[PDB]
C-alpha cells in the first residue's frame, strides 16, 4: 500500500526541495538535492487503489532502467495522498526550446544525429518492455550534444484529460498521436485504456524528425478538430515544400505509415538514419 | 445595415462608453457565474459579463493581443455584442462585453423542448446581417459560429460574441475543449482554403439542431423522430465529411425553412450559399416581414 525510499539502490539520506523547474500539466516539478536531482511531486484521490497499485509496478519496472540516452529514474516514494517521482536533473534546454530559438542553427548532420540519440534511449526502452507513450519535444533535453529522454511510461497514469462531456486537448498532443490512436479519442476515453504501443512510440518520433526539420509542429495552423480528422484517415505533411530531399522525407513515410506493422522498429530505424547524407 | 430604433441604443450604448475608461480586476465584484461571470463594476454603474482566458506568455505578445482586441471598440452593428475593453489581470486576460439576460442559444434550447421556425427566422436573418457586417465592414470571418455563440436578450435583439478578431490569440491559444458536439464545416476539417462559407454551414448546422432539439449527426431513427413530435470523435467527423449532410423533417417545417438550410448544409463551400444569397432567399424575405414578439417568446419560455 505504500512504497518506500529505502527500498531503492541509490542510497537515500535527506531530500532537499527547491524551486520549482517550470509549469506542467502532470504534477509540479521541482529542483531538487540528494547532487541536484529533479523532483516530481503527485497527488493521488486515494481512488483506483488498483491503478495505483499497477502504478508502483511500472515504478519498480522504472528501477531496472540505466541508459544513456534515458533519464536516469533514481527513486520514488509513495505516502499517500502524495506520491513523489525522482530522476536526474537534466542541464540544458528541453529540444522544444533549442528548435524554437533563431540564434541554433540545425543542420541536416546534426538533426541526424540527435534523432539517432532519440532513437537508440527509445530503443532500449523497447528492449525493455516500456512504452513512452507521451514523447514530445519538451520531454527531450538537449545539452551541447547530450540527448536524454524525459516522462516515460508517466501517461498511463497522468490523468492530463480529467468539461462535461469535452476532452481536453493541448496544442502539440495530436499531432504525435498515430492514428489508431486518434481514432479512439472521445470525451470520457482515459489514459490507461489507450491503444499505445511500441508502434504509437515510433509514430510519435516521425512528429519529433518533421519537428527537426520543419523547426515546428505539423498541422501547426489548423484546429484541434482538422487535425483528428485529416490524421485519422492518413494525411500527413512532407518536407519538401523546405526542399529537404528524398532520404529525409522517406523516414516520415515509414514512421507515420498509417499501418501499424508498416512502421519500423527503433533498431531498424537507426538503421535507415544511419544512411542519409 | 438601417434602422432609427436600433440607432436609438446603440448610441446610447457610446453615451454609457464613456465612462468606461480603463478596467482592473479590483474594479469588479462576482456576481454570478453563467470562463464567463457576470460581474459588477463600481467606477460606473454598469453591470458587466467579463470573460476570462487563462495563458501565460511573454509581455509583449499579449500587448500585442490586446492591440488587436481593442479593434472591438470600432466594430459596432446591433448583430453583433458591444465591447467594453479587454485587460491582463492574474495572468488571465479578460474580455469585458454586454452581459445580455437570456444567456445563449443551446441553454435556451435546454430550457425549450424545440425552438420554433419563425423565431429561428429572426435568428437567420440577424446572423446573416452579422457575418455580412463583420465581412464586408472589418475583413474578418466569425470562425466558430455555434449556438452558445448567439446571445438574446430582454429587449429582443440577438447578437454574435466570440467571434476571431485577433490572429495571435489563435496561436496564443494553450489548449482546445473538443467534444461531441462538432460545427465545423467539411472544408476545414479537410484542410482546404475557407471562408465565411464555412460560418454559413455553422450556422445552418445550428439552425437543425435547435430546430429538432438534438445535435442532428448521426440522424437519428425512425423511432427517435417520432418520439421528438457512445462514439469516438473522430467518427463524427468522418461523418461530417463523407456521409450527406442532415437535413430537417419533411413534415413539421415549410419547404422555404428546409431549402434555407440546405443551402447552408451543402458540402462545398462553393455551391453553399454565400451571405448575399441568403440574403435574397424566400425564407429570411418571408421571415423578416413577420410580427413575432421574441421578448415574449423568451421572457414566457425562459421564465
Ligand atoms: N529532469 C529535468 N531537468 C530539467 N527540467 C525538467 C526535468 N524534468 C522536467 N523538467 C521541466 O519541468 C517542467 C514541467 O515538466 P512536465 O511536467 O513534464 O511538463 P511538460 O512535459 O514540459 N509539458 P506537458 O506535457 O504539457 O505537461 C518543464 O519546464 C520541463 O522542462
Ligand atoms: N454576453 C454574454 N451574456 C450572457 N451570457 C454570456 C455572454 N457571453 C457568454 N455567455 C455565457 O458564457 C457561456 C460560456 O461561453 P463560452 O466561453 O463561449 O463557452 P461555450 O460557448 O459555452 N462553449 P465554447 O465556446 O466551445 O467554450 C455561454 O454558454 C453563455 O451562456
Ligand atoms: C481565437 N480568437 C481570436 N480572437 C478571439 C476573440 F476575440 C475571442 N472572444 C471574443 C471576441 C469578440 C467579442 Br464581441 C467577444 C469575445 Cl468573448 C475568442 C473566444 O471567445 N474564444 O473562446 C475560446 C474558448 O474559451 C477567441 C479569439
Redesign the interface.
Given at each position: 500500500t505504500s512504497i518506500f525510499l529505502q527500498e531503492w539502490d541509490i542510497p537515500f539520506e535527506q531530500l532537499e526541495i527547491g524551486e520549482l523547474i517550470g509549469?506542467g500539466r502532470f504534477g509540479q516539478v521541482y529542483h531538487g538535492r540528494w547532487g541536484e536531482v529533479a523532483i516530481r511531486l503527485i497527488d493521488i484521490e486515494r481512488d483506483n487503489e488498483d491503478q495505483l497499485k499497477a502504478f508502483k509496478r511500472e515504478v519498480m519496472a522504472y528501477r531496472q532502467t540505466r541508459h544513456e540516452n534515458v533519464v536516469l529514474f533514481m527513486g520514488a516514494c509513495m505516502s499517500p495522498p502524495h506520491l513523489a517521482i525522482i530522476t536526474s536533473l537534466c542541464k540544458g534546454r528541453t529540444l522544444y526550446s533549442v528548435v524554437r530559438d533563431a540564434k541554433i542553427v540545425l543542420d541536416v548532420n546534426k538533426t541526424r544525429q540527435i534523432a539517432q540519440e532519440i532513437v537508440k534511449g527509445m530503443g532500449y526502452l523497447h528492449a525493455k518492455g516500456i512504452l513512452h507513450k507521451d514523447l514530445k519535444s519538451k520531454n527531450v533535453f538537449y545539452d551541447n550534444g547530450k540527448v536524454v529522454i524525459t516522462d516515460f511510461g508517466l501517461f498511463s497514469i497522468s490523468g492530463v484529460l480529467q468539461?462535461e462531456?469535452?476532452?481536453?486537448?493541448?496544442?502539440g498532443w495530436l499531432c504525435h498521436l498515430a492514428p489508431e490512436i486518434?481514432?479512439?479519442?472521445?470525451?470520457d476515453?482515459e489514459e490507461d485504456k489507450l491503444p499505445f504501443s511500441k508502434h504509437s512510440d515510433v509514430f510519435a518520433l516521425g512528429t519529433i524528425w518533421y519537428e527537426l526539420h520543419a523547426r515546428e509542429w505539423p498541422?501547426k495552423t489548423?484546429?484541434?478538430?482538422?487535425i483528428?480528422?485529416?490524421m485519422?484517415?492518413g494525411?500527413k505533411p512532407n518536407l519538401s515544400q523546405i526542399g529537404m530531399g528524398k532520404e529525409i522525407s522517406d523516414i516520415l513515410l515509414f514512421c507515420w505509415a498509417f499501418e501499424q506493422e508498416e512502421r519500423p522498429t527503433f533498431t531498424k530505424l537507426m538503421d535507415m538514419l544511419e544512411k542519409l547524407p | 445595415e438601417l434602422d432609427e430604433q436600433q440607432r436609438k441604443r446603440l448610441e446610447a450604448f457610446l453615451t454609457q462608453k464613456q465612462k468606461v475608461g480603463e478596467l482592473k480586476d479590483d474594479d469588479f465584484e462576482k456576481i454570478s457565474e453563467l470562463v464567463v461571470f457576470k460581474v459588477s463594476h463600481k467606477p460606473s454603474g454598469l453591470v458587466m459579463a467579463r470573460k476570462l482566458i487563462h495563458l501565460?506568455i511573454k509581455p509583449a505578445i499579449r500587448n500585442q493581443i490586446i492591440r488587436e482586441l481593442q479593434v472591438l471598440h470600432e466594430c459596432n452593428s446591433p448583430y453583433i455584442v458591444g465591447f467594453y475593453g479587454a485587460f491582463y489581470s492574474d495572468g488571465e486576460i479578460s474580455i469585458c462585453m454586454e452581459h445580455m439576460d437570456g444567456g445563449s442559444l443551446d441553454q435556451v434550447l435546454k430550457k425549450a423542448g424545440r425552438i420554433p421556425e419563425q423565431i429561428l427566422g429572426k435568428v437567420s436573418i440577424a446572423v446573416i446581417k452579422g457575418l455580412t457586417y463583420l465581412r464586408e465592414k472589418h475583413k474578418i470571418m466569425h470562425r466558430d459560429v455555434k449556438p452558445s455563440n448567439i446571445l438574446v436578450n430582454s429587449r429582443g435583439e440577438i447578437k454574435l460574441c466570440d467571434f476571431g478578431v485577433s490572429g495571435q490569440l489563435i496561436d496564443s491559444?494553450?489548449?482546445?475543449?473538443?467534444?461531441?458536439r462538432?460545427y465545423?464545416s467539411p472544408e476545414?476539417?479537410?484542410?482546404t482554403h475557407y471562408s465565411v462559407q464555412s460560418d454559413i454551414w455553422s450556422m445552418g448546422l445550428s439552425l437543425v439542431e435547435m430546430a429538432v432539439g438534438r445535435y442532428p449527426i448521426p440522424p437519428p431513427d425512425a423511432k427517435e423522430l417520432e418520439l421528438m413530435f457512445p462514439?469516438?470523435?473522430?467518427?463524427l467527423?468522418?461523418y461530417i465529411?463523407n456521409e450527406p449532410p442532415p437535413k430537417l423533417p419533411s413534415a413539421v417545417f415549410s419547404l422555404e425553412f428546409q431549402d434555407f438550410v440546405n443551402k447552408c448544409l451543402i458540402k462545398n463551400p462553393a455551391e453553399r450559399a454565400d451571405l448575399k444569397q441568403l440574403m435574397v432567399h424566400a425564407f429570411i424575405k418571408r421571415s423578416d416581414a413577420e410580427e413575432v414578439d421574441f421578448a415574449g417568446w423568451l421572457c414566457s419560455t425562459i421564465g
Open positions: 509549469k468539461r462531456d469535452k476532452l481536453r486537448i493541448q496544442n486518434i481514432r479512439q479519442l472521445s470525451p476515453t498541422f489548423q484546429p484541434a478538430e482538422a483528428i480528422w485529416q485519422g484517415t494525411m | 501565460e491559444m494553450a489548449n482546445s475543449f473538443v467534444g461531441t462538432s465545423m476545414r476539417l479537410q484542410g462514439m469516438a470523435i473522430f467518427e467527423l468522418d465529411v
